[PDB]
From Swiss-Prot, chain B:
This is Hemolysin E, chromosomal. It comes from the Bacteria. Monomer and oligomer. In periplasm, it is present as a monomer, while in outer membrane vesicles, it oligomerizes to form a pore structure that is active. The pore is formed by a dodecamer. The chain holds residues 88 to 141 of 303 of the full protein. Induction: During anaerobic growth. Weakly or not expressed in most strains. It is activated by SlyA, while it is silenced by H-NS. Its expression is also regulated by CRP and FNR. It is found in: Secreted; Periplasm; Host cell membrane. The gene is hlyE. Changing Y10H: Strongly reduces cytotoxic activity. In outer membrane vesicles, the redox status prevents formation of the disulfide bond, leading to oligomerization and pore formation.
């Protein structure tokens, strides 16, 4: 669960730049999608 | 895990002075470091009480 909470907090801090087209936030969201799908495949 | 990526984002974004993101980068830095000092202090106090229990 800590491996997911780290990426969730990182994306939450990347939101605060107030730039939705920032490529780093796009890459963080694409990383969270893969992490959540790999968590759901296990349960 | 959060700090070592936010600081790398700080080094990556501000090789030159980007004045648009300058007012928010300071708030991000202050928020993550004030979170970190509190977490590290609470971890040290917990380990100290666990050492004193014996």
């Amino acid at each position: 669960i800590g491996e997911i909470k780290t990426e969730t907090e990182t994306t939450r801090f990347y939101v605060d730049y107030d730039d939705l087209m920032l490529s780093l936030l796009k890459e963080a969201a694409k990383k969270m999608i893969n992490t959540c799908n790999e968590y759901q495949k296990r349960h | 895990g959060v700090a070592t990526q936010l600081l790398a984002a700080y080094i990556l974004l501000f090789d030159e002075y980007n004045e648009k993101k300058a007012s928010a980068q300071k708030d991000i830095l202050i928020k993550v470091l004030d979170d970190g000092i509190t977490k590290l202090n609470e971890a040290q106090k917990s380990l100290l009480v666990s050492s004193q229990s014996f």
